């Protein structure tokens, strides 16, 4: 159904140890496709997916020029933000940036966004209308007054609606076998006795895509989402994801409990039980 | 594809 393209940028100062470290990465949905690293030997935007490699020399030269311009801009932003917040030269600080666009089932423009962060907290963010900003504090309003004067929102809105979507559409067609696939989760349950009284029932879900998944537990019909040990949806390493949810149960009452699983690739949601 | 960006904070 819905899809998205997003670029993530990180810039970290290393005072008296060369230039700031700059890492940029591009995603389509939950599949990474490009990267750039300022410490790497190549000094180029490199491919991190099979389907992007078919792009000619003009694409890669163009992306290298643009990502180099990002790198050098966020280098200045570090110096600017240090002066804004009145911090010492020797201290290390972080600048994070994210932008991109979403699309619906029809591949039309759903929404866009463009956000900044300094030392973990939110700095400045483009609102959903793409014509106005949200300033976190004193310093963010200084940047807001500059960017309202420079008509930056009008420039970003044109990209996010126009260009961002056209490239997202084009990547989805290029990597049809990778991006538009939908791998179903391979589920199974496992039993482990904690004590004479207690017993744990873990409900797995392996090798699925995309990462959006729901694993809830029920005690004979009704939900009991409290006392359910969830974990982060973690990457397997080969493109697919993993997740599990565990519950503590009295010994000899395992078949009362059931694990409900919901996923895009699943036509109907699976209901698991202990053997 | 990246947008061409030089605009500073």
């Amino acid at each position, epitope marked *: 159904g819905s899809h998205s393209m997003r670029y993530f940028f990180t810039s970290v100062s290393r005072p008296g140890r060369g230039e700031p470290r700059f890492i940029a990465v591009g995603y389509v949905d939950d599949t990474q496709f490009v990267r750039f690293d300022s410490d790497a030997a190549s000094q180029r935007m490199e491919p991190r997916a099979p389907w992007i490699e078919q792009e000619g020399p003009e694409y890669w030269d163009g992306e290298t020029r643009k990502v180099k311009a990002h790198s050098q801009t966020h280098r200045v932003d570090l110096g600017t933000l240090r002066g804004y917040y009145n911090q010492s030269e020797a201290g290390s600080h972080t600048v994070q940036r994210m932008y991109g666009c979403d699309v619906g089932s029809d591949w039309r423009f759903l929404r866009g966004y463009h956000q900044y962060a300094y030392d973990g907290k939110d700095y400045i963010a483009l609102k959903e209308d793409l014509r106005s900003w949200t300033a976190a504090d004193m310093a963010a309003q200084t940047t807001k007054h500059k960017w309202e004067a420079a008509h930056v929102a009008e420039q970003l809105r044109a990209y996010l609606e126009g260009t961002c979507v056209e490239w997202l559409r084009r990547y989805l067609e290029n990597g049809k076998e990778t991006l538009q696939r939908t791998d179903a989760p391979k589920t199974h349950m496992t039993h482990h006795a904690v004590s004479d009284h207690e017993a744990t029932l873990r409900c797995w879900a392996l090798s699925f895509y995309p990462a959006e998944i729901t694993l809830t537990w029920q005690r004979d019909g009704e939900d009991q989402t409290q006392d359910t040990e969830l974990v982060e949806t973690r990457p397997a390493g080969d493109g697919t994801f993993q997740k599990w949810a565990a519950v503590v149960v009295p010994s000899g009452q395992e078949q009362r409990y059931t694990c409900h699983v919901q996923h895009e690739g699943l036509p109907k949601p699976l209901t698991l039980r202990w053997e | 594809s990246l947008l*061409m960006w030089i605009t500073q904070v």
Partner: T-cell receptor
Amino acid sequence: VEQNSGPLSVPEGAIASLNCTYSDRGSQSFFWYRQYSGKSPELIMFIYSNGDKEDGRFTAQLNKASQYVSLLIRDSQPSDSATYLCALTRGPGNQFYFGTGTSLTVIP
Amino acid sequence: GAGVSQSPRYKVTKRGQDVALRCDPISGHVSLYWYRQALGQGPEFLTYFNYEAQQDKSGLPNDRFSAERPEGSISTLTIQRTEQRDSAMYRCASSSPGGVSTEAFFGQGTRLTVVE
């Protein structure tokens, strides 16, 4: 960025009309430069919003639907005799394009 | 500095020698563009820089032409093995102080004449 074919001759005190079309519909900022004989180009006006922009005797007009810009010199003096250059950019960080230029001579 | 400053203003060169045209832009201007302007024509695009990195080299007429901007400020257009047809008015220009979009501020120019 294709500009109108020079030269152009206009009487003193008359309205001079300069036009310029462009292919790239994604161009954001538009400019009108003026270049005297053996001098560098200097800026007269800038425009990005549609419709008219007045600055004294000069009046620029952008029509981004029909994709052209134009400069209107009202009550033109001999000191306006120059080669008028149209210029545009797709945005900050991109190339800065120029038209071929129209050679205006205001007949005294 | 205050405005853009090229050097030299005028230059005579023997046919076959190399030349280096200097361009000192306005302080803090990110973009720096190069042009050549033939007699009674508009500025033809050559190349430009963002910060330090030369962007597209396509506008440079042939491989004898080359340009750098090593420390992200002063640029230097370099023509090797000059020919009579290289003679032109070479202008540079800077823009975008602190990255915000502005007009292109022009330098005084370099009148290059390649004599046989």
